[PDB]
Amino acid sequence: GNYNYLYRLFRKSNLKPFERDISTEIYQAGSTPCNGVKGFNCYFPLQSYG
């Protein structure tokens, strides 16, 4: 796998055309008060193609 290449899997709302959101902040999927910290329902918002 090549791990240089990635995409966003999670967001709070969809992009408008060319809305260039680069932020990597940990995604609270509602249940867990993640506050930017990893754990259950505290997802990394991207994925690598590998």
């Binding site: 408008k16 055309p17 060319f18 809305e19 260039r20 959101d21």
Partner: protein
């Protein structure tokens, strides 16, 4: 972490700033004035300077000034 860069009361200078689909559009107009108090009643229209294809989510803004 610097994803873009560029370089080029006797008067009233007017500007307009807006964004469409990441294209940030800049408009201007200048004149001398004699109502030194406040905004003049009569008409004028601004014209474009640049459109910057920058893609940023914008909702808030602030001005910058000289300091002593």
């Amino acid at each position: 972490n610097c994803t873009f860069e560029y370089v080029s009361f006797k008067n009233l200078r007017e500007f307009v700033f807006k964004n469409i689909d990441g294209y940030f559009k800049i408009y201007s107009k200048h004149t001398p004035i004699n109502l030194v108090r406040d905004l003049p009643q009569g008409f004028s229209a601004l014209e474009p300077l640049v459109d910057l294809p920058i893609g940023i989510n914008i909702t808030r803004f602030q001005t910058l000034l000289a300091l002593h």
